[PDB]
Design an enzyme around this catalytic site. Structure first.
Site, PDB file in Angstrom:
ATOM      1  N   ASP A  22       0.870  -1.168   0.000  1.00 48.21           N
ATOM      2  CA  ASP A  22       0.000   0.000   0.000  1.00 48.21           C
ATOM      3  C   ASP A  22       0.908   1.219   0.000  1.00 48.21           C
ATOM      4  O   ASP A  22       1.917   1.270   0.715  1.00 48.21           O
ATOM      5  CB  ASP A  22      -0.967  -0.019   1.194  1.00 48.21           C
ATOM      6  CG  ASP A  22      -0.265  -0.033   2.528  1.00 48.21           C
ATOM      7  OD1 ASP A  22       0.193   1.047   2.964  1.00 48.21           O
ATOM      8  OD2 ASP A  22      -0.176  -1.125   3.134  1.00 48.21           O
TER       9      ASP A  22
ATOM     10  N   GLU B  61      -7.600   4.685  12.296  1.00 51.92           N
ATOM     11  CA  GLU B  61      -6.520   4.515  13.258  1.00 51.92           C
ATOM     12  C   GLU B  61      -6.323   5.691  14.221  1.00 51.92           C
ATOM     13  O   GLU B  61      -5.314   5.755  14.918  1.00 51.92           O
ATOM     14  CB  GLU B  61      -5.211   4.260  12.514  1.00 51.92           C
ATOM     15  CG  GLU B  61      -4.807   5.393  11.594  1.00 51.92           C
ATOM     16  CD  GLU B  61      -3.555   5.063  10.805  1.00 51.92           C
ATOM     17  OE1 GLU B  61      -3.670   4.391   9.752  1.00 51.92           O
ATOM     18  OE2 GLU B  61      -2.456   5.463  11.251  1.00 51.92           O
TER      19      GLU B  61
END
Length: 347
Positions: free
Chosen positions: A18, A108
């Site tokens: 990613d 997150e």
């Protein structure tokens, strides 16, 4: 004592990575030749940040035949559906209409929001993305973050878990299995500068779930068993066997061995002589705008046990004489049942 955990890494999983604007220019051909199969690209953050390399990365990755996915960095201090729309509008803005992996919610941070509310916000975002795209989603987060700042309601979505330094994601109180595992942020990948984010993905990361990857063949003209050899040659070593009548999975035909099938039966992977292989009947839906019911037995009053999504591929096992007009089948999920013939197309 008992210790329930998620699955561990596995070379059998898809190799993924990613990236975000932080990586600047990336040589995707190099990434393609480094074993990487799927690439998740950062698209947006909150309703106030557009990763300016998303278009370049999406086109570069697609040019190399790689599978692509996009992720949105959630900022709970901004509207949840507002962000969902910001995210999808940008994907459209850059012409990214052919991504192959589920849209990812990167959650997150809490931005000071409580557990109940932060989880509720994530849910709102996820459902709005599904509403806007008609496509599926995946939740990305870290083990301890989920255990401390989110509640189990997010367990209804598949997870792409982040946990470095381990071969197995740690105890999780929301998910019991993962479709994605980000095990390192300091990997070395050709075409990516600095430390690269590393991932393992199961086939569930894909939006296209119509495939059938179960047994597609059986034996024929075999009195007892069909030998599995190391190579398409009787000069090759017998590394396994298939008892007459059993099913197995044809993987493909190899050029150096025409006339043989490269298969897999009960853990073994080898070559079998095609003269003794009979392909099973595959099929899909026909005239099914939504889904097709799979019933316990061939009758309209029979308990519905599963469903075949428009375009899904299943296997026709046989015609049960008790239920003429119906086929006894096996779904891509391993489930058996009956389906109305008027809605089946043989492949």
């Amino acid at each position: 004592h008992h210790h329930h955990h998620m699955q561990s890494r596995n070379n059998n999983n898809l190799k993924g990575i990613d990236v975000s604007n932080w990586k600047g220019n990336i040589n995707f051909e190099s990434v393609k030749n480094d074993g990487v199969e799927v690439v998740y690209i950062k698209a947006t953050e909150g309703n106030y940040f557009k990763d300016k390399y998303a278009k370049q990365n999406y086109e570069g990755a697609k040019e190399q035949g790689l599978s692509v996915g996009f992720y949105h960095f959630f900022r709970a201090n901004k509207g949840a559906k507002d962000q969902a729309n910001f995210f999808i509008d940008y994907l459209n803005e850059i012409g990214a209409v052919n991504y192959d992996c589920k849209l990812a919610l990167d959650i997150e941070t809490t931005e000071g929001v409580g557990v109940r509310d932060l989880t509720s916000m994530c849910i709102e975002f996820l459902e709005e993305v599904k509403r806007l795209t008609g496509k599926e989603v995946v939740v990305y987060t870290y083990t301890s973050f989920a255990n401390n700042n989110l509640d189990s309601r997010l367990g209804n979505y598949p997870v792409w878990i982040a946990h470095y330094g381990v071969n197995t994601p740690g105890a999780n109180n929301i998910w019991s299995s993962w479709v994605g595992f980000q095990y390192s942020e300091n990997g070395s990948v050709a075409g990516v500068n600095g430390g690269c984010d590393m991932n393992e993905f199961t086939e569930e990361i894909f939006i296209d779930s119509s495939n059938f990857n179960l047994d597609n063949a059986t034996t024929k003209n075999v009195s007892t068993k069909l030998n599995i050899r190391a190579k398409g040659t009787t000069n090759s070593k017998i590394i396994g066997s298939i008892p007459a009548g059993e099913t197995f999975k044809i993987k493909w035909v190899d050029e150096d061995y025409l006339g043989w099938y490269y298969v897999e039966y009960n853990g073994v992977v080898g070559y079998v002589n095609a003269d003794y292989v009979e392909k099973l009947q595959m099929a899909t839906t026909y005239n099914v705008s939504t889904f097709l019911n799979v019933r316990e037995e061939g009758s309209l009053n029979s308990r519905i046990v599963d469903k075949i999504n428009s375009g899904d591929i299943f296997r026709i096992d046989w015609v049960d004489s008790d239920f003429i007009g119906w086929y006894r089948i096996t779904t891509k999920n391993g489930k058996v049942g009956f389906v109305n013939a008027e809605f089946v197309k043989k492949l």
